[PDB]
Structure formats: structure tokens, C-alpha cells
Design a protein around this ligand. Structure first.
Ligand SMILES: *C(=O)[C@@H](NC(=O)Cc1cccs1)[C@@H]1NC(C(=O)O)=C(COC(C)=O)CS1
Length: 265
């Protein structure tokens, strides 16, 4: 029984686990704690890039953005290396998705603009996709740090799955922008030990991870069966019982995804 298996994983990892897979053709929705709030962590970067793409002509990707020492405030694998030269919006989108680059995400929030350094416009973009649940209140690093239970900077597995479904599978974006987002997620470098680890090699996986304090580890993905049937998979987790410095545990997400893949095969 799937709920029993997820509960077992919670005990194993001293964790809270949330899972959502939207209903399809012939599969019922898979849901476990799916309407409970979990921190976005870096998973917000996927709809953030969608927001920036949606808001601008495609060639806005070629605009150079400059930034300085005091902008580097978080893990930023790419932005730290290009600080002397600047990065185009396209490079920033690439880095935010594929390297979960915090500086890139903050610069993209600022590009979107408006109150809260772009966080209000980001939330407004989610509202436009019918998500009345999620909220972004802070940028990097702060957004990963809210105490367990705090609603700031949270989504739910259910809400983020429906958002990702519209972005990648639905018509939230025009085909050209949809393809840019899909390809960046397809080329993600940070997700090998999460949802990807739970699906057989002949299934395509594209994803965006998130990791935070209190043992937070998330992954949102679109997967395609060997025959081209797509599913959206959102797995979120925290280990609040270990306090702020609790280790995130990717293996929890890999096991949860393995359980999901078993049902979807
Ligand atoms: C987004 O989740 C962001 N997280 C943080 O900046 C907070 C943390 C820093 C170290 C551990 S949590 C970036 N994204 C990811 C990710 O998986 O998407 C990170 C993953 O790190 C580990 C550990 O697996 C950290 S940086």
C-alpha cells in the first residue's frame, strides 16, 4: 500500500514527506500530505524562469546583466565565476535552473521587478496560473530559512505540481518559451539522486531541485514513459525534528520516487 510505504519512509528518515502526481488518462492522482505546506526552497526557480520568459520578448535572453560582490549572498556556482563580466538573462535562467544558482535567481527576481524585489510579481505569476496557495516572500538565502510550519516561502506538492503541469505540458507558455524551460530542466545537473534515481533509465526525466535548512529536500519533475506518456511528480520533504542544521536526505526522495515509478509502470 502506497500510503503505508510513504509513512515507512517518514519513520526511516525522521521526516515529513509530501507527494503529488496529478491524475491522467487512466491513473488516479497520487497524493500523500499533498495539501500540506512545504518550503519552496530552490524549486521556485522553475516558475521564476517561466515568469521572466512570459514577461518579455524572447530576445530579452540576450540582455547583459551586471552585478557585484555584494550580490553574491548564496550558493551561486555559475554567477560567482562570471562576476567580472556579467551574465545575459539567458545565462541567468540557465544557471538558476541547472545549477540552482541563488544569485542568478535573485537577479531574475529583480528583472521581473516590482515590490519585494520581484517576490510579489513572482507570486502574481503563480496566481495567474490558478495557484491560490503558494507564496514567495524572500529571496536567496532567506527563503530557505523559515521555521517549520511558517507559511512564508511555501508551496504544496499539489499546488506546485499543477503549476509545473501547465508550464511544461499545458499552454501557460508559447511553444518556443515552453521549449526553453523544458530543455533547461532536461539538462539539470543537480537532480541525479532524487526523482531521476527512482525512475528506470528508459523514462525521460526533467527536474528542478530544492534544498534548505531543517533538512529540507525537494524535487519537482516531469517524467515521460518509454511510450511518451507524461506525468508530473512533486516530492517535498523536511526533517524539522533535527532542527535548523538537520541534514537534507536525498535518498528519501529517491525511495519515494521509486515507489511512485512502481505504480506508474
Ligand atoms: C535552493 O534550494 C538552494 N538552496 C540553498 O541555497 C540553501 C542550501 C544550501 C545548502 C544546502 S541547502 C540551492 N539549491 C540546491 C538544490 O538542490 O536545488 C542545493 C542542494 O544542496 C545539497 C546539500 O544537496 C543548495 S543551493
Amino acid at each position: 500500500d502506497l500510503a503505508d510505504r510513504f509513512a515507512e519512509l517518514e519513520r526511516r528518515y525522521d521526516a515529513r514527506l509530501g507527494v503529488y502526481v496529478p491524475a491522467t488518462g487512466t491513473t488516479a492522482a497520487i497524493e500523500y500530505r499533498a495539501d500540506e505546506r512545504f518550503a519552496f526552497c530552490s524549486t521556485f526557480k522553475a516558475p521564476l524562469v517561466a515568469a521572466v520568459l512570459h514577461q518579455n520578448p524572447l530576445t530579452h535572453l540576450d540582455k547583459l546583466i551586471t552585478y557585484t560582490s555584494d550580490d553574491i549572498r548564496s550558493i551561486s556556482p555559475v554567477a560567482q565565476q562570471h562576476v567580472q563580466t556579467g551574465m545575459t538573462i539567458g545565462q541567468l535562467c540557465d544557471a538558476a535552473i541547472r545549477y540552482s544558482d541563488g544569485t542568478a535567481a535573485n537577479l531574475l527576481l529583480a528583472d521581473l521587478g516590482g515590490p519585494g524585489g520581484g517576490t510579489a510579481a513572482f507570486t502574481g505569476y503563480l496566481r495567474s496560473l490558478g495557484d491560490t496557495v503558494s507564496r514567495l516572500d524572500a529571496e536567496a538565502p532567506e527563503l530557505n530559512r523559515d521555521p517549520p510550519g511558517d507559511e512564508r516561502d511555501t508551496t504544496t506538492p499539489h499546488a506546485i505540481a499543477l503549476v509545473l503541469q501547465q508550464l511544461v505540458l499545458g499552454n501557460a507558455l508559447p511553444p518556443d518559451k515552453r521549449a526553453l524551460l523544458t530543455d533547461w530542466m532536461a539538462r539539470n545537473t543537480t537532480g541525479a539522486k532524487r526523482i531521476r534515481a527512482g525512475f528506470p533509465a528508459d523514462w525521460k526525466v526533467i527536474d528542478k531541485t530544492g534544498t534548505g535548512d531543517y533538512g529540507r529536500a525537494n524535487d519537482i519533475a516531469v517524467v515521460w514513459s518509454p511510450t511518451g506518456v507524461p506525468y508530473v511528480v512533486a516530492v517535498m520533504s523536511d526533517r524539522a525534528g533535527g532542527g535548523y542544521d538537520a541534514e537534507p536526505r536525498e535518498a528519501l526522495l529517491a525511495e519515494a520516487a521509486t515507489c511512485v515509478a512502481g505504480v506508474l509502470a
